Design a protein around this ligand. Sequence first.
Ligand code: W51
Length: 167
Amino acid sequence: VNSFSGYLKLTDNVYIKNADIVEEAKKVKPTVVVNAANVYLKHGGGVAGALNKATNNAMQVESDDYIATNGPLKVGGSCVLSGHNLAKHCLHVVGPNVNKGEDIQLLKSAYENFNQHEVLLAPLLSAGIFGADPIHSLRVCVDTVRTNVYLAVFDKNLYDKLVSSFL
Ligand SMILES: Nc1ncnc(N2C[C@H]3CC[C@@H]2CC3)c1Cl
């Protein structure tokens, strides 16, 4: 049993709810919240800008030190950093950004990072300002992630479309 509430069950392991990952993280304090990161861990908008704002910029400060030591992530890659006031840990995952020309096949590699964590509060990857088709992102998620994932998708006309089109 866990603390996640109000989710629709899509499969054995994937759940979906119309909630802000920020407001959802603040309520649940999950072990892992996933950030929709870029390779530079520059949290400017969407899930990343919103998560970072909710940490009062502490996520960005920590991230800048990580990059100064380790250099940029790979597209499809991830790192584990603090969850600050939102979660125990934040898994920063880089999905491909279509608005930069990245290979959408890298989306499966991105979601494979989730399998290193038994439970994750997570966003839809490459959604939003990353430019991918969210229906495709949900299909890759279901077909790739084997651990228990709670997607918080803060957007009605899209939540309802994802549910009503889910095979
Ligand atoms: N705070 C959030 N929580 C959950 N999902 C978010 N997404 C999901 C789609 C794509 C990125 C943005 C817009 C709707 C955000 Cl910004």
